[PDB]
Design a protein around this ligand. Sequence first.
Ligand SMILES: CCCCCCCCCCCCC/C=C/[C@H](O)[C@@H](CO[C@@H]1O[C@H](CO)[C@@H](O[C@@H]2O[C@H](CO)[C@H](O)[C@H](O[C@]3(C(=O)O)C[C@H](O)[C@@H](NC(C)=O)[C@H]([C@H](O)[C@@H](O)CO)O3)[C@H]2O)[C@H](O)[C@H]1O)NC(=O)CCCCCCCCCCCCCCCCC
Ligand SMILES: CCCCCCCCCCCCCCCCC(=O)OC[C@@H](O)CO
Ligand SMILES: *[C@@H]1O[C@H](CO)[C@@H](O)[C@H](O)[C@H]1NC(C)=O
Ligand SMILES: O=S(=O)([O-])CC[NH2+]C1CCCCC1
Ligand SMILES: [Cl-]
Ligand SMILES: [Cl-]
Lengths: 279, 101
Amino acid sequence: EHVSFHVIQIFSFVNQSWARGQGSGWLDELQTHGWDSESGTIIFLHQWSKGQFSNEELSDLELLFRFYLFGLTREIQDHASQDYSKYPFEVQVKAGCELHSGGSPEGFFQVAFNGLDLLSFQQTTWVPSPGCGSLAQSVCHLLNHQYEGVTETVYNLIRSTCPRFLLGLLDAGKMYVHRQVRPEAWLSSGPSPGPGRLQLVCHVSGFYPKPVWVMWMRGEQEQQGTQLGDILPNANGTWYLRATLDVADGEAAGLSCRVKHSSLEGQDIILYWRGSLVP
Amino acid sequence: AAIQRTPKIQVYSRHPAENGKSNFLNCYVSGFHPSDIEVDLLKNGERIEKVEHSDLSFSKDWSFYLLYYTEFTPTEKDEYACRVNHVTLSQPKIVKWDRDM
Ligand SMILES: CCCCCCCCCCCCC/C=C/[C@H](O)[C@@H](CO[C@@H]1O[C@H](CO)[C@@H](O[C@@H]2O[C@H](CO)[C@H](O)[C@H](O[C@]3(C(=O)O)C[C@H](O)[C@@H](NC(C)=O)[C@H]([C@H](O)[C@@H](O)CO)O3)[C@H]2O)[C@H](O)[C@H]1O)NC(=O)CCCCCCCCCCCCCCCCC
Ligand SMILES: CCCCCCCCCCCCCCCCC(=O)OC[C@@H](O)CO
Ligand SMILES: *[C@@H]1O[C@H](CO)[C@@H](O)[C@H](O)[C@H]1NC(C)=O
Ligand SMILES: O=S(=O)([O-])CC[NH2+]C1CCCCC1
Ligand SMILES: [Cl-]
Ligand SMILES: [Cl-]
């Protein structure tokens, strides 16, 4: 019952002149917003992506994002052109908010330097990451002293603007966020894990929401030997999942893949292994 | 300090590989860092030109992931692969798409 909304930013500082930035907005795992870096604008990936915010409010958000990009790049490049051997380097920012069951908002703002935790914004104070100290401590000191309104703006964004915008987004996109897409399931014979051995593969593709149960079983006995893969993304917000099992040939008859998913409405998906048994 | 993470490359079709029916080939490149990566979808060896891909994103450990996908009609004669190059790879890694999977 928990939902989040995130804005992620990825900055690559290549030299004291070049630096490229990317940004996107994400409701849970569905991307809802992109960022056009040439125009410096929000890209609304869905009809409901404006989330019951006015065009004035959103153009002002774009204004603030543009100014924040400008100043962030300016100050970082100012510090780095004095350590040019440090180029290239990457900065990642994950801001946003999580709506907890009962309606409790927890905002968060986290920054990584070169894929390592640099610092976070806990409650109302910048906190450096334990480890990666000197640079963290420095940046955290600068943020907690020189950069005035930056801190208050961050707090109000992740604690007030973010949850309001999030609930507006869920209200506007109620038909897409709560959709149910029935998966397609098929069977295959993977690579022989040995002579006599036999690799049964069960594919389940095209399902939303992401939670899914896939299991090889004989009757009710779930085979403890099933190897479940990762849930991988398809385009257009559906998911794919492979579950395999290697058995002895001749003992493969009677095995069956079983798939449970909310979209099924109870009637689970069952696919028996046929092999060369069906004329 | 800096962390370098090698990309995980997974190739899978959106629908059962029915020779003659259109389909989508997905290459999911995940868990890599830094962000600069070069991903190509290859049909029989040459690079496919009509390739879409998601906006860059990153997991909670800050490692990046990307979904490259293309419409394609698989045939018996055709072999499809995903070629990834990254600073963590001495030379580009090529993962063939297992039709039989
Ligand atoms: C919207 C805005 C709000 C947010 C903004 C806030 C964040 C912005 C940025 C925050 C960073 C602040 C923390 C800084 C920490 C450290 O200060 C400073 C380094 O510390 C020491 O510094 C010294 C220099 O001073 C270094 O020694 C230099 O090493 C070099 C090797 O390449 C050379 O050897 C050089 O030698 C010479 C030479 O050979 O000629 C001698 C000359 O004298 C020198 N000439 C000088 C010095 O003037 C010349 C120079 O390079 C050029 O001038 C020539 O072109 O070079 C020698 O000087 C020394 O290593 C180094 O340890 N860290 C950094 O750099 C890290 C990079 C900065 C940003 C990285 C992290 C990103 C910020 C964090 C996220 C951003 C904010 C988070 C939240 C977002 C908003 C809420
Ligand atoms: C930056 C911290 C904000 C946290 C609270 C956000 C409140 C939600 C309202 C935002 C509306 C649109 C969301 C995505 C905006 C576009 C974007 O992805 O921009 C990234 C850019 O900046 C990096 O180049
Ligand atoms: C700075 O980085 C950009 C991005 O590749 C490049 O075009 C430019 O030439 C670089 N400067 C150098 C290599 O001196
Ligand atoms: O509806 S949803 O399934 O949550 C959307 C998933 N988008 C994926 C496609 C791009 C690659 C990673 C995320
Ligand atoms: Cl820029
Ligand atoms: Cl078959």
